[PDB]
């Protein structure tokens, strides 16, 4: 079935460039046009660029203003968005999309692009400890979004709440919690697994009472 896998975003300084990639499978790639569409919580979906099936015609949205280039490599079943001259207003989630003549039949998972002068900051991770018991992990002072948090490498899946982050003084902070039976914590360790891709951070913390 159809797969579209985005890569290549993350943090970039104003005036610098980034190249996004979409690796596709599950259909004859060279028979279809491809597109990029971005989203901001304020401005909704905004079309950025399209490319013809054969690769030799491109189209761009009004906000691109001659700064971006879309390309495709049919041999590698991938297409690309080269984004030059980036500005704060380009911070967004970027989706790749397959076309079927007149509509977008499948969308990728989206990758975040953050355009900022601030450097990457890795989080500090702190265990949170107090029938049922709720344990937590504080993921403090990171930049940019996102982070991901799992529990016992995914073995604890129900009872997990990961809370949207707060932003203060330029850094993000969030908490994740997991609710387990008392017997779980007394029978085995409970660990949170925090990842912050922008800083290549991966941290495991056991919850100590």
């Amino acid at each position: 079935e159809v797969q579209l896998v985005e890569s290549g975003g993350g943090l970039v300084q104003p005036g610098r460039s980034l190249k996004l990639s979409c690796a596709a499978s599950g259909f004859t790639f060279s028979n279809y046009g491809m597109a990029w569409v971005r989203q901001t919580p304020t401005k909704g979906l905004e079309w950025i660029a399209s490319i013809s099936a054969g690769g030799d015609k491109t189209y761009y949205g009004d906000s691109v203003k001659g700064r971006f280039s879309i390309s495709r490599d049919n041999a590698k079943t991938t297409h690309y968005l080269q984004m030059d001259s980036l500005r704060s207003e380009d911070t967004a989630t970027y989706y790749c999309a397959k076309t079927s003549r007149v509509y977008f039949d499948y969308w990728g998972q989206g990758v975040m692009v953050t355009v900022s002068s601030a450097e990457t900051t890795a989080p500090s991770v702190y265990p949170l400890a107090p029938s049922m018991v709720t344990l937590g992990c504080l993921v403090k002072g990171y930049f940019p979004e996102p982070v991901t948090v799992t529990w016992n490498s995914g073995a604890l899946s129900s009872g997990v709440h990961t809370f949207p982050a707060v932003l203060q003084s330029g850094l993000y902070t969030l908490t994740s919690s997991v609710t387990v039976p008392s017997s779980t914590w007394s029978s085995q360790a409970v660990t949170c697994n925090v990842a912050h891709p922008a800083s290549s951070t991966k941290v495991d913390k056991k919850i100590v009472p």
């Binding site: 009004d62 007149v102 949170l128 709720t134 707060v166 203060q168 908490t175």
Partner: protein
């Protein structure tokens, strides 16, 4: 090239019918196909309608598309509305460029009111080693979303150092969180700290003590 105008939000009840509109400003709506996408919060869009009125395999027949010449608009009709239809719906067309509507956020009403649950956590010994202390308040299981969060220290209000997130949907209910940043000396020195949430005329609170 033109704009597509959608109402920002619509509310409706379980099992009701809603008609979501998408008006083209300039040029005739019928001159280029209109498509519709559903997007759940935090997820990618999926296609509900393409080519004005066609459904992908898998989309319920509760969903149907039409074109209304007289109002220069496309319509997404949802019959027998379900809880899983709560989502943002985007219309899409084109002429010399690709145009999206602003999205309509559909809410399905009927869920009963639920008061918040609080969980509070003290600073970790590892954080206190660093001379910092973050008090954590987790607010969950509440509906509707409107809440006020406040902190107290030895019983009195403390506003400096507070960071609170706006509520966000998780499943059928909302969650939010709040943090009180203190000096490690400020934490060790107090007798207690409290997180208080006000929701629907009720307060819920929990306290932390060193």
């Amino acid at each position: 090239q033109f704009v597509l105008t959608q109402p920002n939000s619509v509310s409706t009840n379980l099992g009701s019918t809603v008609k979501l509109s998408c008006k083209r400003s300039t040029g005739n709506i019928g001159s280029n196909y209109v498509n519709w996408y559903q997007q759940h919060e935090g997820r990618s869009p999926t296609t509900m309608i393409y080519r004005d009125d066609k459904r992908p395999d898998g989309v319920p027949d509760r969903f149907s598309g039409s074109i209304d010449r007289s109002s220069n608009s496309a319509l997404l009709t949802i019959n027998n509305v379900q809880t899983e239809d709560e989502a943002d719906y985007f219309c899409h067309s084109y002429s010399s460029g690709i145009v999206f509507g602003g999205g309509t956020k559909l809410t399905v009403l009927g869920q009963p009111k639920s008061t918040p649950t609080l969980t509070v956590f003290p600073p970790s010994t590892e954080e206190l080693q660093g001379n910092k202390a973050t008090l954590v308040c987790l607010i969950s299981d509440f509906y509707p979303s409107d809440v006020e969060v406040a902190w107290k220290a030895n019983g009195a209000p403390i506003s400096q150092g507070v960071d609170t997130a706006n509520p966000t949907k998780q499943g059928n209910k909302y969650i939010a969180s709040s943090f009180l940043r203190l000096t490690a000396e400020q934490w060790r020195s107090r007798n207690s700290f409290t997180c208080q949430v006000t929701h629907e005329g009720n307060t819920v609170e929990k306290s932390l003590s060193p």
